[PDB]
Design a protein around this ligand. Structure first.
Ligand SMILES: Nc1ncnc2c1ncn2[C@@H]1O[C@H](COP(=O)(O)OP(=O)(O)O)[C@@H](O)[C@H]1O
Ligand SMILES: Nc1ncnc2c1ncn2[C@@H]1O[C@H](COP(=O)(O)OP(=O)(O)O)[C@@H](O)[C@H]1O
Ligand SMILES: Nc1ncnc2c1ncn2[C@@H]1O[C@H](COP(=O)(O)OP(=O)(O)O)[C@@H](O)[C@H]1O
Ligand SMILES: [Mg+2]
Ligand SMILES: [Mg+2]
Lengths: 98, 529, 529, 439
């Protein structure tokens, strides 16, 4: 106890509670791009720190502009760029399916 | 109230912020607990069913790993006792390449069992002697457990079966595909004359399709682009320069001086004419592509395009040396027409695109070449890096097989046999060293327990069935993974093997770590800063 | 109180307080150091502010690495080092005597005795002890077998039993190989090199040199079967005029001429070496190796590589001497007198690569006067532990050769002085008999600590030893596995003669000075700012 | 070519730690060692200050030496500590105590033998090294004592490589160590005959610029490192980036140092003023260049109006047009030409780098060789002489094994050096008793 193994401030979680929490986390990411699919889909407006505004319907572009830091959610962001870099179309379809 | 006034002697002279532990209670019992905690962290990352683990270092970088040595490097430990185990595991990786988790499980289990022996009346001096004798007795037994042999290390079909087990514990489900790839790359950089060097296998990661579309390229590939207007060559003669592709100047300061009208006008014309002849002289030998390790000039580029010379630039001082080996050419330190001996060859050089990326490919039609490269295609960066670590583990196994050709059964069949035979020897040793010997044999079981725990079955049913079968004389019976009910299986017939040198070093370094910790009696620590 | 009225921020400790502080703090250093004495001593762990680990058992190493802030712990530490750099062994026994010597003198002072009376007792006891030691020493031939015992007795108290068997042969052999006739042993010619690979039992002795750097050009040969060695410190690097100078040309054509001309000073030097190589090495059967203390340009490397001349750059200053006595060449500064008579000889040169770092071996010299010790191990802290134990072994052997005598140890001698000092104390006059009696008990801390650390009783065992040596006049010491009396010379325990003579001189001087201190005062400027 | 950087003591380690920090964030390097830039202009000369290890890693060419682990542990544990070479850290166990004798005779003697081995291992990895860089302070014992010993050992080992240094000059108004003048006088004596040139910087002007001109009524040392680290970058900047004329450190010596003994410069950094003035001052070429000859941008206690400049050098950073730079330079050269050189006209050396230092719109760097530096060295000597007469605190130096004659020896050179600068002015050559009789 007086000498602790790992440095103070280390966060450690595991088990079923950890795994279920990752499943619910990805639902928020798929929510931001859900209603941008279809012949009757909408856009989203995002404003960064400096005030510049970006209006876009491209699914891969929206996920880039979000400042996601959740480690499990970042997987869904990367597959968006994967579909972007190979075929270029289907960036939202690969996200809802995930 | 009153206070306890800091008894005199060494306590009153000690600097503030420092610590001083003494005796068995405050030094050895604490160190064993600290070591025990470290084992439980990576214990779940053992075996084919060992679950992945996710680590974020202090630089916000993301790692998803099964490799035990990788986890410890990015985890940062502060207890001195745990650090000793870490340095032991890192040494085993450098010397062998696989078995970085066998050290932690074995060294952790040894210290836990040595706690009770000290608890019932033995001393630290007698425990160490008992451990060391078993370590010597373990090695003498080990050669008797060899059950297979590597026959020909340039046979593609045979080798793929040798590396499959070394990959089965990393990428369960895709072990067949990855085993075939690494076999092709390693078997065709092989030298006749010996000395398989490991650096001669290159890995290039390209984002895109699934992992099944990755392949092997007999040559080298770079993520660059051509400078001139020439793009592809069909039968290339290559010249390699380590100097900038431009007119040279004196290293000492040198200025141009003019005193008359004619010299002012004739300077610019003279310089251009000299450059034209130098490039034409290069093209006279037949070179098709020029590769340089430095800056290129505009006039050289213009004349290179005129004479149909392909020009590339890359400055690594380590990629260029690798390129020299691949084509057989030799470097040049000055812009001179290359000698026919000094020019390499290549069957095709071209610029291609793969998954939104531009690459330059030096492809041989020769099966052997000098070095080979494996192209990785995945859907995420984290997915590639873990596969990259698997390729390293598979290659390092091939490196060992060249050094030694003997295999031993895996899946817990080796450790069970050692525990059975050490105890039989331990029964015939009178004295107080008989207890430590039996404890050493008892620690070997944790490796069959660790596999069984992660498999989702009861450990005691397997261990009981392994002992009963091994008493009948079966030295090749180990744990079965596919069975949802605990069971055993024959390992030699199932082709599950591991290198003899992997076990020989793993046992040696593990015990050396345990006895090193037990020799400590007191700790003096300086304050952090 | 006479110093506070001038500088109120001053700290002082007057007559009886000053003695109390010194004696109570000197005892503090003894309570922790007494567990190091003898081969049964306990190993400590040390951690600095960075988180490093350094296991040790030495006396001097422990003193400087323990967090202590005390004035009287600074006087002792400075003496222990002064006893270290000269003699090389005997630092732990230094502290034990000084602490025990102050304890005994305090025993009589507390009854109202002036300290100067005891001081005169120490001098009378010191002179008598130095005369007794002069007649106990054993003179021998210093054959190899005797030096083995002296080296073993000093390498056994600082590593485990099995390792001290290996290091003992290497230490004795290395001293003999470099030892000419009466000319004194000159160290700095026993190169200590550490290689972090393989188990620590592979420490060996190489009858030549090892260099921590190798060939830098790619096409240099990695092995040579019969080599000529050229040792020079001349520079083959591009150099410029001391006085300022610049190049003034007129056009492109003249610029090229000035470029080629400026390499002529260096290219002349390179041609001199090649012309010599063709002469002595007429056929392509021998070898040629160039060792330079300065840098070498890439252009110079290319010229040398075309002739198969292995070349190394920027070797250390000491190796400019060791290579001369090993191979047998001449260290020359210029090439204006190059001749075949100045080349050395060596029977094997090859290169070893350890991951990032490379090594080169010079072996099979005809009659080497210099050798190297190669240290191998799996950890950084282990290598340092071996390095310190090697330093003490060389000093112990060298002292046994410079002196013609060796003194039996194991605790036998101090008992002998204790006996002879008792029978002299009735002769002296006054209360100085108390000083002699105090010294006699001080010398008995060595036998007590040895028995105490093995697990025996101090009073019962020491009386057994004094029961002998009083009815049988043989020199009898302590046995560490039975507690019985033991004849020191017959078993093989030995101790240097200069160590004991200097140990008695140093300890008495400090205790004499410390006891005469009136007051401790700190009245000066607080900090140097 | 190849250069090596070496830091010693308290002040040297701090500046060097920041210096490597304000280099990695330009060239695309990261605190793990990879290169993450997309511009090939950064990697052309990346190898001058760096080594490349297998796997794409890059490591600095730096040696950190101190006699106490406290400072080295701070850098090792602090930011960017994982980048440095593991074995390059060399540390003692007892410190120096700021007694110049202790760091020059007793402790530094047994440490250089181990440090000299390290610099050999770094020099073995370069095809052709060109020179060294040293960073040290003149007040601490290790900076002065061990710094003097290191340079003497370096000179004997290496015959003709250049010796560039970055030493801070003590400001006696900030006296600190009661015995400051002893440390400063001896080191300068050795520096005169063993280095090509030294760049002096005082903490006084380091204190004034942030406090008065900018903000932060209480500026701590942490900001002071940033200001000097800005100056570190620039004299050194050209070296790591290409240019139309290859300006190497050797031609800096010949073109900036007319005399081998008067070779002490004071630098200048214009584009940094108040935060509001950073916005509202119209940062154009001539007002930015106007800070070169100002009384505020200087970082030495030497009045220029009472002095005469010898040679000047101007370094420009940013992507401009070529015309306006020369136009204003032509203007400025003749604007205040009254207070200019005595016999060396047209000293201006112009250097332009496309990529500016990261962070700001505009940047330049100025170097000047003054005849007013003697005003600084004179004051040091005057304070030194007043103490030597009383022999105050002398036993702490003489009693360590150094002869008293050295204190009198070093004094003579300081008077000799001052006489040299005084000779080149011809203005300072301009009575109480009543003896004015026949002849
Ligand atoms: N004429 C159509 N009728 C029905 N569905 C359509 C039609 N045109 C497009 N879609 C739908 O649009 C979806 C994807 O649109 P798109 O923006 O390309 O997705 P992504 O962002 O994943 O590329 C497809 O699943 C397809 O079913
Ligand atoms: N098909 C298999 N069935 C059961 N166990 C296996 C199989 N393949 C490998 N193993 C086990 O995996 C272990 C090593 O895997 P790994 O996690 O890499 O450990 P280490 O890190 O120590 O190399 C071996 O002890 C072996 O018994
Ligand atoms: N095998 C042995 N048996 C008995 N005494 C020994 C033996 N080896 C060493 N000693 C004793 O140990 C004492 C201390 O030596 P060592 O442990 O090296 O520390 P130091 O030399 O600093 O006192 C010596 O006086 C020697 O007599
Ligand atoms: Mg494995
Ligand atoms: Mg000893």
């Amino acid at each position: 106890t007086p000498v602790i193994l790992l440095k103070e401030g280390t966060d450690s979680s595991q088990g079923i509670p950890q795994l279920v929490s990752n499943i619910s986390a990805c639902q928020v990411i798929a929510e931001a791009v859900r209603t941008t699919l279809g012949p009757r889909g909408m856009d989203k407006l995002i404003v960064d720190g400096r005030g510049k505004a970006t209006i876009s319907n491209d699914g891969a572009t929206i996920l880039k502009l979000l400042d996601v830091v959740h480690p499990a959610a970042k997987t869904l962001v990367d597959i968006a760029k994967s579909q972007d870099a190979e075929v270029g179309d289907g960036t939202t379809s690969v996200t809802l399916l995930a | 109230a009153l206070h306890v006034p800091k008894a005199p002697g060494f306590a009153q002279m000690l600097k503030e912020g420092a610590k001083h532990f003494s005796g068995l209670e405050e030094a050895v019992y604490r160190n064993i607990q600290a070591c025990k905690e470290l084992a439980q962290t990576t214990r779940t990352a053992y075996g084919p069913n060992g679950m992945n683990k996710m680590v974020i270092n202090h630089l916000e970088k993301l790692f998803v790993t099964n490799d035990a040595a990788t986890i410890l490097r990015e985890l940062e430990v502060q207890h001195p006792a745990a650090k000793m185990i870490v340095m032991a595991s890192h040494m085993q990786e450098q010397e062998v390449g696989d078995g970085t988790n066998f050290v932690l499980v074995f060294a952790g289990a040894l210290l836990e069992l040595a706690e009770e022996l000290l608890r019932i009346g033995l001393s630290v001096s007698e425990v160490i002697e008992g451990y060391e004798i078993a370590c010597r007795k373990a090695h003498e037994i080990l050669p008797n457990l060899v059950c297979c042999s590597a026959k020909n290390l340039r046979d593609i079909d045979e080798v793929s079966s040798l590396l499959r087990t070394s990959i089965m514990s990393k990428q369960y489900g895709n072990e067949v595909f990855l085993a075939k790839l690494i076999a092709q790359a390693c078997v065709s950089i092989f030298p006749d004359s010996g000395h398989f060097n490991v650096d001669n296998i290159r890995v290039c990661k390209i984002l895109g399709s699934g992992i099944s579309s990755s392949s092997v390229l007999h040559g080298m590939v770079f993520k660059k682009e051509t400078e001139g207007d020439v793009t592809s060559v069909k039968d290339a003669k290559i010249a390699v320069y380590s100097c900038p592709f431009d007119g040279m100047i004196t290293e000492t300061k040198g200025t141009v001086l003019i005193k008359t009208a004619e010299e002012l006008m004739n300077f610019s014309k003279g310089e251009e004419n000299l450059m034209d002849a130098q490039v034409k002289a290069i093209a006279d030998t037949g070179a098709n592509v020029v590769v340089t390790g430095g800056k290129v000039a505009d006039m050289a580029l213009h004349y290179a395009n005129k004479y149909n010379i392909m020009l590339v630039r890359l400055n690594s001082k380590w990629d260029l040396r690798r390129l020299c080996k691949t084509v057989g050419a030799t470097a040049l330190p000055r812009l001179t027409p290359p000698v026919l001996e000094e020019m390499g060859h290549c069957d095709s050089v071209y610029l291609s695109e793969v998954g939104d990326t531009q690459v330059v490919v030096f492809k041989h039609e020769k099966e052997d070449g000098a070095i080979s490269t494996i192209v990785l295609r995945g859907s995420t960066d984290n997915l590639m890096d873990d596969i990259e670590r698997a390729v390293d583990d598979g290659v390092n196994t091939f490196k060992v097989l060249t050094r030694d050709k003997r295999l031993v059964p895996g899946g817990g069949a080796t450790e069970i046999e050692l525990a059975k035979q050490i105890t039989s020897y331990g029964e015939t040793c009178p004295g107080l060293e008989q207890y430590a010997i039996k404890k050493f044999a008892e620690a070997f079981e944790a490796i069959p327990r660790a596999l069984a725990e992660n498999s989702g079955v009861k450990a005691n049913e397997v261990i009981s069935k392994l002992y009963a079968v091994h008493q009948e004389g079966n030295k090749n019976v180990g744990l079965d993974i596919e069975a949802e009910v605990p069971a055993v299986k024959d390992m030699l017939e199932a082709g599950i093997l591991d290198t003899y040198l992997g076990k020989y070093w793993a046992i040696k370094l593990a015990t050396n770590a345990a006895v090193t910790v037990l020799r400590v009696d007191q700790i003096i620590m300086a304050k952090p800063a | 109180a006479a110093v506070k009225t001038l500088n109120p921020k001053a700290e002082v400790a007057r007559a009886q307080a000053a003695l109390a502080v010194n004696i109570s703090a000197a005892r503090g250093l003894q309570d922790v150091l007494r567990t190091n004495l003898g081969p049964k001593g306990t190993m400590k762990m040390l951690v600095s502010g960075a988180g490093d680990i350094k296991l040790t058992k030495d006396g001097n190493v422990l003193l400087h690495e323990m967090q202590i802030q005390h004035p009287t712990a600074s006087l002792i530490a400075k003496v222990a080092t002064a006893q270290d750099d000269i003699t090389g062994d005997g630092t732990t026994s230094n502290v034990l005597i000084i602490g025990e010597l102050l304890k005994q003198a305090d025993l009589y002072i507390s009854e109202g005795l002036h300290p100067r009376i005891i001081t005169e007792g120490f001098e009378a006891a010191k002179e008598k002890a130095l005369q007794f030691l002069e007649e106990v020493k054993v003179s021998r031939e210093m054959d190899r077998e005797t030096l083995i015992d002296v080296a073993r007795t000093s390498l056994r108290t600082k590593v485990h039993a099995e390792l001290a068997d290996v290091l003992t042969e290497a230490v004795v052999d290395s001293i003999l190989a470099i030892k000419k006739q009466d000319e004194p042993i000159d160290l700095f010619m026993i190169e200590i090199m550490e290689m972090k690979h393989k188990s620590e039992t592979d420490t060996s002795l190489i009858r030549g040199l090892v260099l921590d750097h190798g060939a830098r050009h790619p096409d240099m040969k990695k092995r040579v079967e019969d080599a000529y060695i050229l040792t020079c410190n001349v520079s083959l690097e591009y150099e410029k005029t001391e006085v300022n100078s610049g190049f003034f040309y007129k056009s492109a054509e003249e610029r090229e001429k000035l470029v080629k001309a400026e390499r002529k000073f260096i290219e002349d030097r390179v041609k001199k070496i090649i012309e010599l190589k063709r002469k002595v090495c007429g056929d392509s059967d021998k070898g040629f190796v160039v060792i330079n203390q300065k840098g070498i340009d890439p252009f110079s490397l290319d010229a040398l590589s075309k002739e198969g001349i292995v070349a190394l750059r920027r070797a250390k200053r000491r190796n400019m001497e060791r290579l001369t006595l090993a191979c047998g060449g001449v260290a020359l500064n210029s090439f204006d007198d190059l001749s075949p008579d100045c080349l050395g000889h060596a029977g094997l040169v090859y290169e070893y690569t350890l991951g990032e770092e490379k090594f080169t071996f010079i072996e099979k010299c005809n009659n080497p006067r210099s050798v190297t010790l190669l240290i191998k191990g799996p950890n950084k802290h282990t290598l340092t532990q071996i390095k310190d134990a090697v330093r003490d072994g060389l000093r112990a052997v060298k002292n046994a050769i410079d002196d013609g005598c060796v003194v039996p140890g194991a605790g036998a001698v101090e008992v002998a002085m204790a006996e002879a000092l008792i029978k002299h104390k009735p002769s002296v006059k006054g209360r100085a008999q108390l000083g002699v009696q105090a010294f006699a008990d001080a010398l008995l801390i060595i036998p007590k600590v040895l028995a105490q650390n093995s697990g025996f009783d101090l009073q019962e065992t020491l009386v057994k030893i004094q029961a002998e040596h009083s009815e049988s006049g043989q020199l009898v010491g302590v046995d560490l596995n039975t507690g019985e009396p033991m004849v020191a010379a017959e078993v093989g325990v030995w101790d240097n003669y200069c160590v004991k003579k200097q140990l008695l001189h140093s300890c008495t001087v400090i205790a004499t000075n410390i006891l005469l201190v009136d007051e401790i005062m700190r009245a000066g400027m607080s900090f140097l700012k | 070519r190849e250069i090596v950087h070496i830091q010693a003591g308290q002040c040297g380690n701090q500046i060097g730690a920041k210096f490597w920090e304000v280099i990695s964030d330009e060239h695309g390097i990261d605190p793990t060692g990879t290169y993450h830039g997309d511009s090939d202009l950064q990697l052309d000369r990346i190898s001058v200050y760096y080594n490349e290890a297998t796997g794409g890693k890059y490591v600095p060419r730096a040696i950190l030496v101190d006699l106490e682990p406290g400072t080295m542990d701070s850098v090792r544990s602090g930011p960017f500590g994982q980048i440095f070479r593991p074995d390059n850290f060399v540390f003692g166990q007892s410190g120096a105590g700021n007694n110049w004798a202790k760091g020059h005779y007793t402790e530094g003697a047994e440490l250089v033998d181990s440090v000299l081995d390290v610099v050999r291992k770094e020099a073995e990895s370069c095809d052709c090294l060109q020179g060294f860089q040293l960073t040290h302070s003149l007040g601490g014992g290790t900076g002065s004592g061990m710094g003097t010993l290191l340079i003497s050992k370096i000179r004997e080992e290496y015959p003709d490589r250049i010796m560039n240094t970055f030493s801070v000059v003590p400001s006696p108004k900030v006296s600190d160590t009661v015995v400051e003048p002893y440390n400063a006088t001896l080191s300068v004596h050795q520096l005169v005959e063993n280095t090509d040139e030294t760049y002096c910087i005082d903490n006084e002007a380091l204190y004034d610029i942030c406090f008065r001109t900018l903000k932060l009524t209480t500026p701590t040392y942490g900001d002071l490192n940033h200001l000097v680290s800005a100056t570190m970058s620039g004299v050194t900047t050209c070296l790591r980036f290409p240019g139309q004329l290859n300006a190497d450190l050797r031609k800096l010596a010949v073109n900036m140092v007319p005399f081998p003994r008067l070779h002490f410069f004071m630098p200048g950094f214009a584009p940094l003023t108040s935060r509001g003035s950073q916005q509202y001052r119209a940062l154009t070429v001539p007002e930015l260049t106007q800070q070169v000859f100002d009384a505020k941008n200087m970082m030495a206690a030497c009045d220029p109006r009472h002095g005469r400049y010898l040679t000047v050098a101007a370094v420009f950073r940013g992507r401009m047009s070529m015309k306006e730079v020369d136009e204003q330079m032509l203007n400025v050269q003749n604007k205040n030409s009254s207070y200019f050189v005595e016999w060396i006209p047209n000293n201006v050396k112009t250097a332009v780098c496309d990529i500016p230092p990261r962070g700001l719109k505009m940047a330049v760097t100025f170097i000047g060789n003054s005849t007013a530096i003697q005003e600084l060295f004179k004051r040091i000597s005057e304070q030194f002489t007043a103490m030597f007469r009383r022999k105050a605190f002398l036993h702490w130096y003489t009693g360590e094994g150094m002869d008293e004659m050295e204190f009198t020896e070093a004094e003579s050179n300081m008077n000799d050096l001052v006489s040299e600068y005084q000779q080149y002015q011809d203005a300072t050559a301009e009575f109480g008793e009543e003896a004015e009789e026949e002849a």
